[PDB]
């Protein structure tokens, strides 16, 4: 379907650069045509708005584009500067060609073809200091196509292997790289954001990729002395405990970070963290609690009378989890029935595999409960203890990757204590009484111990 030149020139064909209400047919002959047709309607005694009907009322033509029904909002849709391009083409087409299209794209931003092959025309598209293009499938690039011009670069949904082909052909201009929905990897690609490549970096948007060291990225910024807009919330590199205050502090560049309104007190509390960051436990270090057990099938309600030799009981309740190693598993929460149970585990993980840590956080990581009942004659007798269980949930943890201190999520593996069985759980102890007278769920909490002041962030010495 496309080479870059053929796809650009195809979409320039898709945008009708010679035809109505833009462009050319009869209608032009005293409005969007050359002068004789026009002027001779005067210099021959006035052919009026009688126009021989070789012409339209141009206000009518414009009214067609303005019409809330005739399509032409862009066409009815996309990148707005393309509607200006149509609007010029109404205003008069004749002069315009690829000569003018080559002049036009000071940026190119006209998303989606599913295409990927970079080539020559971009140079011929003389002005281009920016790209913002997406839903195209590029892998690594004919770098050379870089005119000596490029500042800003969004690439959402590309697939790229390394930055290197492009970066080994650099105009000294790139203010920004961005690659949403993409794939790129490691602490080391930061070298392709060095002054060899891109001393000019003011701006960034780098989610869905997997990029892994804030101080490697500081190596890039020690050589890209420009930063003022950013996306580090959204990469594995944020996971280092000190990230918000460190990133603000780090170098002469980033004036503001992540979402926040100063107008209270923050800034006096928080400048100075990167100094401490020469000293902090520089890796990422996560404390991770598991949650209290619910949907606890009183597998004894099935014997609401429970005290007899099988029926009678003791319980386990545990989770078994995926966390990144691929994955490491433990049977965490293990402890018995009470109509609501309290159960918890905590791990601390010190971590470096930040691409897979990010995979564990984003992807859908896998979690299970196990329940055990005991149902015993004094023999007790126990089947494993007994088993009666649900355990699967897919689970999600981005805020740590957003550079935030903590995640919690709460996971139900599904029903064994139904509400009738729950009413019955209280009815097991109420039938012990009548005789004597989430659905299966855990909580999750995942901290990567980050902080609320410059001094509190200094605690990651200890992390």
């Amino acid at each position: 379907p496309g080479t870059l030149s053929t796809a650009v020139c195809e979409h320039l064909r898709k945008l009708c650069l010679r035809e109505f209400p833009c462009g050319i047919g009869s209608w032009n002959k005293s409005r969007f045509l050359p002068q004789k047709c026009r002027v001779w309607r005067e210099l021959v005694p006035k052919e009026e708005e009688t126009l021989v009907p070789e012409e339209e009322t141009v206000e009518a033509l414009l009214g067609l584009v303005r019409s809330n029904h005739s399509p032409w909002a862009m066409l009815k849709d996309a990148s707005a500067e393309d509607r200006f391009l149509r609007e010029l083409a109404i205003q008069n087409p004749l002069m315009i060609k690829d000569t003018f299209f080559y002049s036009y794209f000071r940026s190119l931003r006209v998303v989606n073809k599913g295409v990927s092959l970079v080539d020559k025309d971009l140079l011929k598209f003389l002005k281009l200091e920016e790209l913002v293009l997406s839903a195209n499938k590029i892998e690594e690039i004919d770098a050379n196509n870089l005119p000596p011009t490029l500042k800003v670069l969004e690439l959402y949904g590309n697939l790229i292997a390394s930055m290197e082909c492009l970066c080994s052909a650099p105009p000294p201009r790139l203010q920004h790289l961005g690659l949403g929905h993409n794939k790129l990897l490691g602490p080391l690609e930061s070298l392709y954001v060095t002054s060899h490549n891109w001393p000019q970096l003011v701006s960034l948007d780098l989610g869905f990729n997997n990029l892994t060291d804030l101080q490697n990225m500081i190596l890039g910024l020690s050589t890209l002395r420009h930063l003022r807009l950013l996306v580090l919330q959204g990469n594995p590199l944020s996971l280092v405990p000190y990230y918000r205050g460190f990133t603000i502090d780090s170098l002469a560049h980033l004036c503001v970070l992540d979402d926040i309104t100063v107008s209270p007190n923050e800034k006096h509390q928080f400048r100075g963290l990167n100094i401490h960051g020469d000293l902090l436990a520089r890796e990422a270090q996560f404390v991770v609690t598991i949650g209290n057990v619910r949907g606890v099938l009183d597998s004894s309600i099935l014997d609401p009378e429970p005290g007899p030799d099988g029926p009678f009981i003791s319980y386990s309740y545990y989770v078994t989890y995926d966390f990144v190693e691929g994955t490491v598993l433990f049977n965490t929460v293990h402890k018995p029935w009470s109509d609501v149970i309290p159960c918890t585990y905590e791990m601390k993980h010190t971590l470096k595999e930040l691409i897979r840590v990010k995979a564990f956080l984003l992807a859908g990581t896998t979690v299970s409960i196990v329940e055990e009942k005991i149902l015993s004659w004094p023999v007790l007798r126990q089947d494993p203890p007994v088993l009666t269980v649900l355990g699967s949930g897919l689970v999600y943890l981005e805020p740590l990757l957003a550079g935030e201190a903590v995640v919690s999520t709460v996971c139900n593996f599904g029903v064994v204590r139904t509400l009738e069985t729950d009413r019955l759980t209280h009815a097991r102890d109420s039938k012990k009484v009548k005789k004597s007278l989430e659905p299966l769920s855990v909580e999750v909490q995942i901290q990567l111990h980050q902080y609320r002041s410059v001094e509190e962030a200094f605690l990651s010495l200890i992390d």
């Binding site: 047919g25 126009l51 009518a60 809330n68």
Partner: protein
Amino acid sequence: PLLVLCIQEPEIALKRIAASALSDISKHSPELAQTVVDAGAIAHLAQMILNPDAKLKRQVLSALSQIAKHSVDLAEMVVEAEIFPVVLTCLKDKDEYVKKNACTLIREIAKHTPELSQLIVNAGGVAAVIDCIGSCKGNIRLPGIMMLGYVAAHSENLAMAVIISKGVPQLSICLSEEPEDHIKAAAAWALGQLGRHTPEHARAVAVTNTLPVLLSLYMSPESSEDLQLKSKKAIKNILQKCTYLPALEPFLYD
């Protein structure tokens, strides 16, 4: 106000020049048209449509078209001045640019809301517009074609009113005999808006032998980009509801 007062003068040339100036003014922003309206120009302009002057009627209808092209309220209040069927009678005058002016005025009127389209239909104007289009050739048919297309695209009852009024064969004639590109593009757009409704729509369109014409036209290299785009749009909107196999049968092999 002076331009409004100039029309009250008995001079036909003064009336024509004032109407031309009003049309030239109220064609750049809705506020200019609103200011002209607030001077009481609508009441006058409706009163010279009956005047048997070619140029005066041309300029009056052009000004009305330029006024009723911006917003819904302007087009609504324009019809409130009892402009029917005095405008509809202008589609039968010996003049051609008067017919073009009337077609453009109607087109601008019933493009905002289906209420104005419904009032025009109830006033019996669709048949008159179709007859004027069939009795004329050239760019004059374009405003009426875009009119009937907007009316069809508005709602279902309006599309039925157009179809029962024999709009589809006229559109086929427009697509066939007109050598111009935007005319046949507009004809394809109107046919697609007609056929995008209930299967009875694409039924009444398919008997008229427009679908093979649209397919050949969108398979023609000499065709323009907008024309092929609109032809494909019409094909997609019609074949998605057409239930007649013998007309969808030729689409298999082509």
